[PDB]
Structure formats: structure tokens, C-alpha cells
Coordinates of C-alpha atoms in Angstrom, one line a residue:
Chain A
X1 CA 0.0 0.0 0.0
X2 CA 3.0 2.3 0.6
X3 CA 5.0 1.0 -2.4
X4 CA 5.1 2.8 -5.8
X5 CA 3.4 5.7 -4.0
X6 CA 4.3 9.4 -3.7
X7 CA 3.0 12.3 -1.7
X8 CA 2.4 15.2 -4.0
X9 CA 2.3 18.6 -2.2
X10 CA 1.0 21.4 -4.4
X11 CA 2.0 25.1 -4.2
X12 CA 2.5 25.4 -0.4
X13 CA 4.3 28.7 -0.9
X14 CA 4.5 31.8 1.3
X15 CA 3.1 34.2 -1.3
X16 CA -0.3 32.6 -2.0
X17 CA -1.0 34.4 0.9
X18 CA -1.2 38.2 1.1
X19 CA -2.0 40.3 4.2
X20 CA -5.6 40.8 3.0
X21 CA -6.1 37.2 1.9
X22 CA -5.5 34.4 4.4
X23 CA -5.8 30.7 3.3
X24 CA -8.7 28.9 5.1
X25 CA -7.5 27.0 8.2
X26 CA -3.9 26.8 6.9
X27 CA -2.2 26.1 10.3
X28 CA -4.1 22.8 10.7
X29 CA -3.6 21.9 7.0
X30 CA 0.2 22.2 7.3
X31 CA 0.2 20.3 10.6
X32 CA -1.8 17.4 8.9
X33 CA 0.6 17.6 5.9
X34 CA 3.7 17.4 8.1
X35 CA 2.2 14.2 9.7
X36 CA 1.9 12.7 6.2
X37 CA 5.4 13.8 5.4
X38 CA 6.6 12.0 8.5
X39 CA 4.9 8.7 7.4
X40 CA 6.5 9.0 3.9
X41 CA 9.9 9.5 5.4
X42 CA 9.5 6.5 7.7
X43 CA 8.6 4.3 4.6
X44 CA 11.4 6.0 2.5
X45 CA 8.6 6.9 0.0
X46 CA 9.0 9.8 -2.4
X47 CA 7.7 13.3 -1.4
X48 CA 7.3 15.8 -4.3
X49 CA 6.7 19.5 -3.7
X50 CA 5.2 21.5 -6.6
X51 CA 6.0 25.2 -6.7
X52 CA 4.3 27.7 -9.0
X53 CA 6.2 30.6 -10.5
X54 CA 4.8 33.7 -12.3
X55 CA 5.4 37.4 -12.4
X56 CA 3.9 38.0 -8.9
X57 CA 5.6 34.8 -7.4
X58 CA 9.0 35.1 -9.1
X59 CA 11.1 32.0 -9.2
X60 CA 13.5 31.5 -6.2
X61 CA 12.1 34.7 -4.4
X62 CA 11.2 34.7 -0.8
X63 CA 7.5 34.7 -1.7
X64 CA 8.0 31.6 -4.0
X65 CA 9.6 29.6 -1.2
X66 CA 7.6 26.9 0.7
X67 CA 6.0 27.8 4.0
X68 CA 8.7 27.5 6.7
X69 CA 6.6 25.2 8.9
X70 CA 6.8 22.4 6.3
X71 CA 9.3 19.6 6.9
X72 CA 11.4 19.5 3.8
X73 CA 14.8 17.7 3.1
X74 CA 17.3 18.0 0.2
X75 CA 16.1 14.4 -0.4
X76 CA 12.6 15.5 -1.5
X77 CA 11.8 16.2 -5.2
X78 CA 10.8 19.6 -6.5
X79 CA 8.8 20.4 -9.6
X80 CA 8.6 23.9 -11.1
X81 CA 5.3 24.7 -12.8
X82 CA 3.8 27.8 -14.5
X83 CA 0.1 26.6 -14.9
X84 CA -2.6 25.3 -12.3
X85 CA -1.9 21.9 -13.8
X86 CA 1.3 20.3 -12.3
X87 CA 1.9 18.2 -15.4
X88 CA 1.3 21.0 -17.9
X89 CA 4.8 21.6 -19.5
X90 CA 6.6 20.2 -16.4
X91 CA 8.9 17.3 -15.5
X92 CA 6.2 15.7 -13.3
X93 CA 5.2 12.8 -15.5
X94 CA 8.9 12.0 -16.1
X95 CA 9.9 12.0 -12.5
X96 CA 6.9 9.7 -11.6
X97 CA 8.0 7.3 -14.3
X98 CA 11.6 7.4 -13.2
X99 CA 10.5 6.8 -9.6
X100 CA 8.1 3.9 -10.6
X101 CA 5.1 5.8 -8.9
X102 CA 1.7 4.7 -9.8
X103 CA -0.2 6.1 -6.7
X104 CA -0.3 9.8 -5.7
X105 CA -1.5 11.1 -2.4
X106 CA -2.4 14.8 -3.1
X107 CA -2.6 17.9 -1.0
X108 CA -2.1 21.7 -1.5
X109 CA -3.6 25.0 -2.5
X110 CA -5.7 26.3 -4.0
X111 CA -8.5 23.7 -3.8
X112 CA -10.5 24.8 -6.9
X113 CA -7.5 25.7 -9.1
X114 CA -4.1 23.9 -9.1
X115 CA -5.3 21.1 -6.8
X116 CA -8.5 20.3 -8.7
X117 CA -6.7 20.4 -12.0
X118 CA -3.8 18.2 -11.0
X119 CA -6.3 15.6 -9.5
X120 CA -8.4 15.4 -12.7
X121 CA -5.2 15.3 -14.8
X122 CA -3.5 12.7 -12.7
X123 CA -6.6 10.5 -12.7
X124 CA -6.9 11.0 -16.4
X125 CA -3.3 10.0 -17.1
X126 CA -3.9 6.7 -15.3
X127 CA -2.6 7.4 -11.7
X128 CA -4.3 6.1 -8.7
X129 CA -5.1 9.1 -6.5
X130 CA -5.5 9.4 -2.8
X131 CA -6.1 12.2 -0.3
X132 CA -5.9 12.8 3.4
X133 CA -9.0 14.7 4.5
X134 CA -8.4 18.4 5.4
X135 CA -5.2 18.9 3.4
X136 CA -6.4 21.5 0.9
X137 CA -7.3 25.2 1.4
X138 CA -8.4 28.2 -0.6
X139 CA -9.7 31.8 -0.2
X140 CA -13.2 33.3 0.0
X141 CA -13.7 34.4 -3.6
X142 CA -16.4 37.1 -3.3
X143 CA -19.1 34.6 -4.3
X144 CA -18.5 31.6 -2.1
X145 CA -16.6 31.1 1.1
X146 CA -13.5 28.9 1.3
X147 CA -15.6 26.4 3.3
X148 CA -18.2 26.1 0.5
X149 CA -15.6 25.8 -2.3
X150 CA -13.7 23.1 -0.3
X151 CA -17.0 21.2 0.4
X152 CA -18.0 21.4 -3.3
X153 CA -14.7 20.2 -4.9
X154 CA -13.9 17.5 -2.3
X155 CA -17.3 16.0 -2.8
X156 CA -16.6 15.9 -6.6
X157 CA -13.3 14.2 -6.1
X158 CA -14.4 11.5 -3.6
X159 CA -14.8 8.2 -5.4
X160 CA -14.7 9.6 -8.9
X161 CA -11.1 10.8 -9.1
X162 CA -9.6 9.7 -5.7
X163 CA -10.2 7.9 -2.5
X164 CA -10.1 9.8 0.8
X165 CA -7.9 8.1 3.3
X166 CA -8.8 6.9 6.8
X167 CA -6.6 8.0 9.7
Chain B
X1 CA -10.7 30.5 -37.4
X2 CA -12.9 27.5 -38.4
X3 CA -10.2 25.2 -39.6
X4 CA -8.8 22.3 -37.4
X5 CA -11.7 23.0 -35.0
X6 CA -14.5 20.8 -33.7
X7 CA -17.7 21.3 -31.7
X8 CA -17.6 18.9 -28.7
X9 CA -21.1 18.4 -27.2
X10 CA -21.0 16.5 -23.9
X11 CA -23.8 14.3 -22.5
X12 CA -26.9 15.7 -24.0
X13 CA -28.9 12.6 -23.3
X14 CA -32.5 12.1 -22.3
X15 CA -31.8 10.4 -18.9
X16 CA -29.6 13.1 -17.4
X17 CA -32.4 14.6 -16.3
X18 CA -35.8 13.4 -14.8
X19 CA -38.8 14.7 -12.9
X20 CA -37.3 16.2 -9.7
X21 CA -33.8 16.2 -11.3
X22 CA -34.1 19.1 -13.9
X23 CA -31.2 20.7 -15.7
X24 CA -31.0 24.5 -15.2
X25 CA -32.3 26.4 -18.3
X26 CA -31.9 23.4 -20.5
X27 CA -34.1 24.5 -23.4
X28 CA -32.1 27.7 -23.9
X29 CA -28.9 25.7 -23.8
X30 CA -30.1 23.3 -26.5
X31 CA -31.3 26.2 -28.6
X32 CA -27.8 27.9 -28.5
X33 CA -26.1 24.5 -29.2
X34 CA -28.3 24.0 -32.3
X35 CA -27.2 27.5 -33.6
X36 CA -23.5 26.4 -33.2
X37 CA -24.2 23.1 -34.8
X38 CA -25.6 25.1 -37.8
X39 CA -22.4 27.2 -37.9
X40 CA -20.2 24.1 -37.9
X41 CA -22.2 22.4 -40.8
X42 CA -21.8 25.6 -42.8
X43 CA -18.1 25.5 -42.5
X44 CA -18.0 21.6 -43.0
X45 CA -16.4 21.5 -39.5
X46 CA -16.5 18.3 -37.2
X47 CA -19.3 18.0 -34.7
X48 CA -18.7 15.4 -31.9
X49 CA -21.4 14.2 -29.5
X50 CA -20.1 12.5 -26.3
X51 CA -22.5 10.0 -24.7
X52 CA -22.0 8.6 -21.2
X53 CA -23.0 5.0 -20.3
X54 CA -23.4 3.4 -16.9
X55 CA -25.7 0.9 -15.3
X56 CA -28.3 3.7 -14.7
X57 CA -27.9 5.0 -18.3
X58 CA -27.5 1.8 -20.2
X59 CA -25.6 1.9 -23.5
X60 CA -28.0 2.1 -26.5
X61 CA -31.1 2.5 -24.2
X62 CA -33.8 5.1 -24.8
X63 CA -32.5 7.0 -21.8
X64 CA -28.9 7.0 -23.2
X65 CA -30.1 8.5 -26.6
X66 CA -29.5 12.2 -27.4
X67 CA -32.2 14.7 -26.7
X68 CA -34.5 14.7 -29.8
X69 CA -34.3 18.5 -30.1
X70 CA -30.6 18.3 -31.1
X71 CA -29.8 18.6 -34.8
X72 CA -27.7 15.5 -35.4
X73 CA -26.7 13.9 -38.6
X74 CA -25.5 10.4 -39.5
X75 CA -22.2 12.1 -40.6
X76 CA -21.4 13.6 -37.1
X77 CA -19.0 11.8 -34.8
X78 CA -20.0 10.0 -31.6
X79 CA -17.8 9.1 -28.6
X80 CA -18.7 6.6 -25.9
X81 CA -17.5 7.4 -22.4
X82 CA -17.7 5.7 -18.9
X83 CA -16.1 8.4 -16.7
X84 CA -16.5 12.2 -16.2
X85 CA -13.4 12.7 -18.3
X86 CA -14.4 12.4 -22.1
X87 CA -10.8 11.3 -22.9
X88 CA -10.4 8.6 -20.2
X89 CA -10.4 5.2 -21.9
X90 CA -12.1 6.6 -25.0
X91 CA -11.1 7.2 -28.5
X92 CA -11.6 11.0 -28.3
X93 CA -7.9 11.8 -28.5
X94 CA -7.4 9.4 -31.6
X95 CA -10.5 10.9 -33.4
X96 CA -9.2 14.4 -32.8
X97 CA -5.7 13.4 -34.1
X98 CA -7.3 11.7 -37.1
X99 CA -9.5 14.7 -37.9
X100 CA -6.5 17.2 -37.5
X101 CA -8.3 19.0 -34.7
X102 CA -6.4 21.5 -32.5
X103 CA -9.3 23.7 -31.3
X104 CA -12.3 22.5 -29.4
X105 CA -15.5 24.4 -28.7
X106 CA -17.0 22.6 -25.7
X107 CA -20.6 22.5 -24.4
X108 CA -22.7 20.1 -22.3
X109 CA -23.7 18.8 -19.0
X110 CA -23.0 18.5 -16.1
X111 CA -20.9 21.7 -15.6
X112 CA -18.9 20.6 -12.6
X113 CA -18.5 16.9 -13.6
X114 CA -18.0 15.8 -17.2
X115 CA -17.7 19.4 -18.7
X116 CA -15.2 20.7 -16.1
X117 CA -13.1 17.5 -16.3
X118 CA -13.0 17.3 -20.1
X119 CA -12.0 21.0 -20.3
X120 CA -9.1 20.7 -17.8
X121 CA -8.0 17.5 -19.6
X122 CA -8.3 19.0 -23.1
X123 CA -6.3 22.1 -22.0
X124 CA -3.7 19.9 -20.3
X125 CA -3.3 17.7 -23.4
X126 CA -2.6 20.9 -25.5
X127 CA -5.9 21.5 -27.2
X128 CA -7.0 25.2 -27.6
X129 CA -10.4 25.4 -26.0
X130 CA -13.3 27.7 -26.6
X131 CA -16.8 28.0 -25.3
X132 CA -20.1 29.8 -26.2
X133 CA -21.5 31.6 -23.2
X134 CA -24.6 29.7 -21.6
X135 CA -23.9 26.3 -23.1
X136 CA -23.4 24.3 -19.9
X137 CA -26.0 23.2 -17.3
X138 CA -26.2 21.2 -14.1
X139 CA -28.6 20.4 -11.1
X140 CA -29.1 22.1 -7.7
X141 CA -26.9 19.8 -5.5
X142 CA -28.3 20.3 -1.9
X143 CA -25.5 22.8 -1.1
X144 CA -25.3 24.9 -4.1
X145 CA -27.9 25.9 -6.7
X146 CA -27.3 25.2 -10.4
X147 CA -26.7 28.9 -11.1
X148 CA -24.0 29.2 -8.3
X149 CA -22.2 26.1 -9.7
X150 CA -22.3 27.5 -13.2
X151 CA -21.0 30.8 -12.1
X152 CA -18.2 29.1 -10.1
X153 CA -16.9 26.8 -12.8
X154 CA -17.2 29.2 -15.7
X155 CA -15.2 31.8 -13.8
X156 CA -12.4 29.2 -13.2
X157 CA -12.4 28.2 -16.9
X158 CA -12.3 31.8 -18.3
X159 CA -8.7 32.7 -19.3
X160 CA -7.2 29.7 -17.5
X161 CA -8.4 26.7 -19.6
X162 CA -10.5 28.3 -22.4
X163 CA -11.7 31.5 -24.0
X164 CA -15.3 32.4 -24.0
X165 CA -16.5 33.5 -27.4
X166 CA -17.2 37.4 -27.8

């Protein structure tokens, strides 16, 4: 169950994240993600961080870096992306092939953008997708709260694209 | 602008659909789709109907059949699917390759399931995607109304996966 399996952690970067826009319940999401990280380390299973880069999240800048609270090691894998989709024009599919990964446990931000897209893509490419409950977050968007957006998308993913894990 | 381009019409089937389970503003959607179908025939451009099948929408059954109101012809293309993603284990990608299609104008039901998935897939496979405004529909879901769901998904898609036609 923990073989040919990677933890895929999407766009957990400081600058997602402005003073006026706080990600919904982020502290608890990062705590839950760090718990998964720790299980992957114990099993020596691959952990892959995806980092987005664009004009307002410039590559290598302080704002592009991963939240400090996340447990990273030089041993982890890092993918650079420029679209919501973590496979779109990236080295993601190649790395998964090189690592013999068929199963992806996915977490990150934002729920309805990069996370949703990468889940639909990964399922569509033939990967087996998994998710730990409460490991995505997003922002109130002026029409729906973060809570409503999260409820909506997680209900779409359950069963049709991925399985939610038990603790 | 009309070369290497197909109209991709998702899941316009009688059984979608039922008393109590009514698609938001469906007649107006099917009217606008028939307008686009007319444009495509004029330019001799491919029109592709996707039809979903499952135990509750059995393949070839009356419920699985396309809404009668749609203007189909024997000459159009038809794709069978089993999952929200119209590319997943289907011959969509092969047909597009065979027909030399790079641009897809996408319509159908339901917004947040098959249409959203097929859009994100088509974009991520490198197709250029387009959409006529008001050509998706879906159901109230117990948390969100059909209109809220449509507003939500269409706003994600705009600029990011596809361009709405002007």
C-alpha cells in the first residue's frame, strides 16, 4: 500500500497568501501535511513539492519559497510549474515514471484551481489518486466562502477521481 | 478560425435529467447549441457528440439516446464514455488526431463533472479550448444551486483553460 506511492504537495508557498487574503485554516492543513510527510519519510517513500512561478511569485524569491513550517529535506523532489496543472509543461510525469510511482497522495492549494486540476489530470493519465481529509485550502472568492468551495470540490473528487484516506 | 476545430457536445442525453432532477435552463442551452451546430455544418467542421453510459444510463437504451431537439446527422462523430473525463479510456484523442483538430469548442452537462473534467483534460493535453456563453447546465446539489455552480466553474475556466467566445 506504501510502495510505488508518492506524496504530491502542491503550491504550499508563502506568497499565496497576502496580508488581506489568508488561506482557510492553513495552520491545521500544514500540521496534517507534516504528519503525512513523516509517514512517507519512515517508509522512504518519495515526497514531491510543486512550486508555481509567475510574475507575482518570481522563481526563487522569498514569496515563491515553501512555508517555513513544512518539513522539507534535500532528499525530497521539487517540480517547477507555470500553470494550475502540475503536469502541464513540467517534468512531473517523467519524475513519476523514473520513480516507478503509480499512486499519488495529493494535498495543496488552491482547492479549486491547481489542486482540482492536478487531481483530474493525474486520474486521467492513469494514476491512482488518494487524499488525506483536510489537506487543501483556498480563499473566499467574493461569491462563495473557502468552506463552500472546499466542500464542493472535495465532494466531486471523492470516489470519482480519488479515495479519501482513513486515519 | 474555423479550420482544425471541432464542436464537442457533452452528454446531451434524455436520462440526465428526470422529474425532480431538472437541468437549469436546458431549453435555452439546447437552442444555443443547435445554432452552433448550424455554424459548424456551414463550415464543414466536425461536430462530436459524447454519450456517457453506466448501469443507470445503459448503453444504447432510450434514456442514453441524445435529446431529440438536437440537430444531429449520421455524418457527425460519436464518442462513448464511462467516466466524467471524455478522454479517459475513450477514442476521443485518436479521433481528434485523425481529424486534425487542435481547437475545441465545448458545451454540455453537467458543468462541474464531465464538462469541467473534459475542459481541464483537453487544455492539459494541448488543445486550444473555446466556449459559447450559456452552453453548460447542471442540477441544484443540496448545497449549491445550479446557477452558483455554473458561475463558479465558468469563472475558473475563463482565461485559464479556455476563452469564452465574444
